[PDB]
Design an enzyme around this catalytic site. Structure first.
Site, mmCIF file in Angstrom:
data_model
loop_
_atom_site.group_PDB
_atom_site.id
_atom_site.type_symbol
_atom_site.label_atom_id
_atom_site.label_comp_id
_atom_site.label_asym_id
_atom_site.label_seq_id
_atom_site.Cartn_x
_atom_site.Cartn_y
_atom_site.Cartn_z
ATOM 1 N N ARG A 27 0.836 -1.197 0.000
ATOM 2 C CA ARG A 27 0.000 0.000 0.000
ATOM 3 C C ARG A 27 0.875 1.253 0.000
ATOM 4 O O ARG A 27 0.564 2.235 -0.674
ATOM 5 C CB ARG A 27 -0.921 0.057 1.207
ATOM 6 C CG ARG A 27 -1.891 1.239 1.186
ATOM 7 C CD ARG A 27 -2.734 1.238 2.448
ATOM 8 N NE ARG A 27 -3.563 2.422 2.607
ATOM 9 C CZ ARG A 27 -3.635 3.182 3.695
ATOM 10 N NH1 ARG A 27 -2.937 2.946 4.805
ATOM 11 N NH2 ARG A 27 -4.455 4.229 3.655
ATOM 12 N N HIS A 86 0.463 4.204 -2.853
ATOM 13 C CA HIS A 86 0.115 5.571 -2.494
ATOM 14 C C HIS A 86 1.176 6.578 -2.914
ATOM 15 O O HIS A 86 0.833 7.672 -3.356
ATOM 16 C CB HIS A 86 -0.113 5.736 -0.981
ATOM 17 C CG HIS A 86 -1.533 5.423 -0.606
ATOM 18 N ND1 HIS A 86 -2.169 5.916 0.508
ATOM 19 C CD2 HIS A 86 -2.450 4.637 -1.224
ATOM 20 C CE1 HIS A 86 -3.406 5.459 0.566
ATOM 21 N NE2 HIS A 86 -3.609 4.678 -0.481
ATOM 22 N N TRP A 140 -10.289 -8.694 2.960
ATOM 23 C CA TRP A 140 -10.931 -9.040 1.702
ATOM 24 C C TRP A 140 -11.051 -10.552 1.553
ATOM 25 O O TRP A 140 -11.903 -11.015 0.794
ATOM 26 C CB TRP A 140 -10.151 -8.446 0.520
ATOM 27 C CG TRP A 140 -10.245 -6.949 0.412
ATOM 28 C CD1 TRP A 140 -11.221 -6.236 -0.227
ATOM 29 C CD2 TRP A 140 -9.340 -5.977 0.948
ATOM 30 N NE1 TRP A 140 -10.981 -4.888 -0.122
ATOM 31 C CE2 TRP A 140 -9.829 -4.704 0.597
ATOM 32 C CE3 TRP A 140 -8.157 -6.071 1.696
ATOM 33 C CZ2 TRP A 140 -9.190 -3.512 0.957
ATOM 34 C CZ3 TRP A 140 -7.526 -4.895 2.054
ATOM 35 C CH2 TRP A 140 -8.040 -3.640 1.689
HETATM 36 C C1 HEM Z 1 -10.212 2.535 -6.098
HETATM 37 C C2 HEM Z 1 -8.920 2.288 -5.518
HETATM 38 C C3 HEM Z 1 -8.694 1.860 -4.193
HETATM 39 C C4 HEM Z 1 -9.260 2.398 -3.041
HETATM 40 C C5 HEM Z 1 -10.514 3.237 -2.854
HETATM 41 C C6 HEM Z 1 -8.402 2.020 -2.000
HETATM 42 C C7 HEM Z 1 -8.772 2.070 -0.637
HETATM 43 C C8 HEM Z 1 -8.286 1.355 0.464
HETATM 44 C C9 HEM Z 1 -8.703 1.506 1.774
HETATM 45 C C10 HEM Z 1 -9.818 2.390 2.308
HETATM 46 C C11 HEM Z 1 -7.813 0.743 2.532
HETATM 47 C C12 HEM Z 1 -7.769 0.568 4.055
HETATM 48 C C13 HEM Z 1 -6.711 1.397 4.742
HETATM 49 C C14 HEM Z 1 -6.701 1.133 6.263
HETATM 50 O O1 HEM Z 1 -7.759 1.168 6.897
HETATM 51 O O2 HEM Z 1 -5.732 0.565 6.765
HETATM 52 C C15 HEM Z 1 -7.042 0.045 1.617
HETATM 53 C C16 HEM Z 1 -6.060 -0.924 1.935
HETATM 54 C C17 HEM Z 1 -4.930 -1.281 1.173
HETATM 55 N N1 HEM Z 1 -4.829 -1.043 -0.143
HETATM 56 FE FE1 HEM Z 1 -6.195 0.041 -1.290
HETATM 57 N N2 HEM Z 1 -7.498 1.147 -2.454
HETATM 58 C C18 HEM Z 1 -7.551 1.174 -3.772
HETATM 59 C C19 HEM Z 1 -6.533 0.673 -4.586
HETATM 60 C C20 HEM Z 1 -5.400 -0.105 -4.226
HETATM 61 C C21 HEM Z 1 -4.477 -0.634 -5.129
HETATM 62 C C22 HEM Z 1 -4.368 -0.213 -6.610
HETATM 63 C C23 HEM Z 1 -3.468 -1.167 -4.320
HETATM 64 C C24 HEM Z 1 -2.177 -1.640 -4.638
HETATM 65 C C25 HEM Z 1 -1.877 -2.460 -5.804
HETATM 66 C C26 HEM Z 1 -3.997 -1.199 -3.035
HETATM 67 C C27 HEM Z 1 -3.420 -1.840 -1.926
HETATM 68 C C28 HEM Z 1 -3.868 -1.842 -0.609
HETATM 69 C C29 HEM Z 1 -3.330 -2.627 0.405
HETATM 70 C C30 HEM Z 1 -2.303 -3.738 0.248
HETATM 71 C C31 HEM Z 1 -4.134 -2.389 1.518
HETATM 72 C C32 HEM Z 1 -4.003 -3.015 2.916
HETATM 73 C C33 HEM Z 1 -2.988 -2.272 3.813
HETATM 74 C C34 HEM Z 1 -2.972 -2.782 5.274
HETATM 75 O O3 HEM Z 1 -3.302 -3.946 5.469
HETATM 76 O O4 HEM Z 1 -2.227 -2.206 6.053
HETATM 77 N N3 HEM Z 1 -5.122 -0.467 -2.965
HETATM 78 N N4 HEM Z 1 -7.142 0.640 0.412
#
Ligand code: HEM
EC number: 1.11.1.5
Length: 292
Positions: free
Chosen positions: A46, A50, A189
């Protein structure tokens, strides 16, 4: 309108970056307890997304090249809440290898985590160069989660990503989880959330989802299995074009691994000009392939 030429860290070559890979990978192994034993793999990919996802194709502002997440404005972006954990992980690595640029380290952290969590190989290029604090993009360039398919499609056009690139990227191995205190969403997920899989697609298709409100008063799709999907995730089966690509990756693991590898490298490289004489992309060996 804004050029960033990759410049290899002086005198470095493949073996130097494999060494940084390994220290990251070894640290991933060792700090296994983080986030109720999820470990730091997910937060590292992530962080890499970002720092790259601030890019804007129109004027080549944002992007991984300048390593600007180290400055307060971006570090403090509400959208980046939780990523401090990832930056802190990487501090000892940066201290051991002070010669690597911040952009290269953030982006290589993402590559390393994906490969160590058993995902596809991601070819990676060096030569990002740190840029001053005034080159830091404003908050607000990362996507919201409470939106629909049309939002997502339009959002990613700014990152020069198409439908198939968007679905491969979001499906992102099914990694880590949402945390209520970071994002206002809560839960994973899928079941294997520190192993890179195509399970996101499977779960979207096969789970029985109910639209509910979480303790932060935000809607999210929830499954009896204990899984969740962001409104934006769920929109990938609401839009018919997204939906056929979701079915495709749910039914072909290798195709998803290859498409993801392409789009992730693409994502990490947006905004960067590589000289014709640049070294070719490096493919790093995992610890397991090195017998380490
Ligand atoms: C429409 C696009 C996406 C949205 C709205 C978005 C949104 C989110 C949200 C709200 C979280 C939770 C953050 C937290 O509470 O810890 C999350 C987790 C994360 N996102 Fe996304 N995301 C998107 C795209 C992506 C993509 C493109 C990647 C990377 C290839 C990605 C990788 C991750 C990862 C690995 C997590 C988990 C991080 C954790 O476990 O600490 N996301 N994202």
């Amino acid at each position: 309108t804004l050029v960033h030429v990759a410049s290899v860290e002086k005198g470095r070559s493949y073996e130097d970056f494999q060494k940084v890979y390994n220290a990251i990978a070894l640290k991933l192994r060792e700090d296994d307890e983080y986030d109720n034993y999820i470990g730091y793999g997910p937060v590292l990919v992530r962080l890499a997304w970002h720092i790259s996802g601030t890019w804007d194709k129109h004027d080549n502002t944002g992007g991984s090249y300048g390593g600007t997440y180290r400055f307060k404005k971006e570090f403090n972006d509400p959208s980046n809440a939780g990523l401090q954990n990832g930056f802190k992980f990487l501090e000892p690595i940066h201290k051991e290898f002070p010669w690597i640029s911040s952009g290269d380290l953030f982006s290589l952290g993402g590559v390393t985590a994906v490969q160590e969590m058993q995902g596809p190989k991601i070819p990676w290029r060096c030569g990002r160069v740190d840029t001053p604090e005034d080159t830091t993009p404003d908050n607000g360039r990362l996507p919201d989660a409470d939106k629909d398919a049309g939002y997502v499609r339009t959002f990613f056009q700014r990152l020069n990503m198409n439908d198939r690139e968007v679905v491969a990227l979001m499906g992102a191995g099914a990694l880590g989880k949402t945390h209520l205190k970071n994002s206002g969403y809560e839960g994973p997920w899928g079941a294997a959330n520190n192993v890179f899989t195509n399970e996101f697609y499977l779960n979207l298709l096969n789970e029985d989802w109910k639209l509910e409100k979480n303790d932060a008063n935000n809607e999210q799709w929830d499954s009896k299995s204990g899984y969740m999907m962001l409104p934006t995730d769920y929109s990938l089966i609401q839009d018919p074009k997204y939906l056929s690509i979701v079915k495709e990756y749910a039914n072909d693991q290798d195709k998803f691994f290859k498409d993801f590898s392409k789009a992730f490298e693409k994502l990490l490289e947006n905004g960067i000009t590589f000289p014709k004489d640049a070294p070719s992309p490096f493919i790093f060996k995992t610890l397991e392939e090195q017998g380490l």
